[PDB]
Amino acid sequence: EPILSFSPKTYSFRQDGRIKEVSVFTYHKKYNPDKHYIYVVRILREGQIEPSFVFRTFDEFQELHNKLSIIFPLWKLPGFPNDVAAKRKIELNSYLQSLMNASTDVAECDLVCTFFHPLLRDEK
Secondary structure (H helix, E strand, C coil), rough: CCCCCCCCCCCCCCHCCCCEEEEEEEEEEEEECCCCCEEEEEEEEECCCEEEEEEECCCHHHHHHHHHHHHHCCCCCCCCCCCCCCCHHHHHHHHHHHHCCHHHHHCHHEEEECCCCCCCCCCC
């Protein structure tokens, strides 16, 4: 039932293509609308050799986990963690690796796919 506030459509790994690799590549400082960090996510689809990159804030990671935890029992989800706060890059990366190792129902659900779908910003 829940949509992702930042996402205009629902996408499925059918249309978008399955994930071979994901990581948090780096973090990036933003000034608009206010000063904040955003995470550059590296995605390699299957049958692809050149990766692509999307931008997601920490608050956008947590909306995904909160929305997943409406659909799925908590033990089906990896733990979510609660600037030199670049430990979030490391912790978000651990979260993504674990998410890919979840049951298929979780790791290939439409919420996860949609989270990785190129947005407004992600058009370089």
